[PDB]
Amino acid sequence: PKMHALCYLRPFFQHELAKTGDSEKRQLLVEYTLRVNNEKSGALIRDVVAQV
Amino acid sequence: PKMHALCYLRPFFQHELAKTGDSEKRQLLVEYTLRVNNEKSGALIRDVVAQV
After folding, report:
1. Which of chain B's residues have a Cβ under 8 Å away from the Cβ of A16?
2. Nearest CA in chain B to A29
3. What distances in angstroms separate CA B30 from CA A1, B5, B35, B41, one per listed residue?
4. Identity of the residue in B18, B20, B22 whose CB atom sits nearest the CB atom of A29
5. Considering A24, A26, B4, B46, which has the largest number of Cβ atoms within 10 A of its Cβ?
6. DSSP A47
7. Listed residue (A2, B25, B14, A10) closest to A35, CA to CA
C-alpha cells in the first residue's frame, strides 16, 4: 500500500448553478490522478477463474 | 478639438454572469455617442495616397 498515491489537482468542491425558477441547483466536482511508485514491487494476476 | 464631444449614456462598467458549469464568465459594457458641433469648422480629405 505504501507505493501508491492518489493525487488531487482539485479536491472535492461544490458550487451553485444558474437559478431558473423556484428551485435550487448544486454541482460537486473533483479532479484526481493515480501515481504508481514502482511496478516492480507488486504483481497482477489476470484471467483467472473459479471452478472453470 | 473644442468642437467634438463624446457623450456617455452609461459609463464603462463590468459584471459577472451566472455559473452554468465548471467555468467563470465576465462581461464588460459601455454605451456612448459622438457629437460634432459644426462641420464647417474642419475638413476631411479622402482618397489621398502617400508616395503612390
Report:
1. 19
2. B22
3. 59, 16, 17, 29
4. B22
5. B4
6. S
7. A2
Residue B31 cell numbers, joined: 454605451
What experimental approach yielded this model? cryo-EM
Which of A22, A17, A42 lies closest to B24 in space, CA to CA?
A: A17
Resolution in A: 2.6
How far apart CA B47 and CA B51 sit, in angstroms, is: 13
DSSP B1-29: -TTEEEEEEEEEEEEE----SS---EEEE
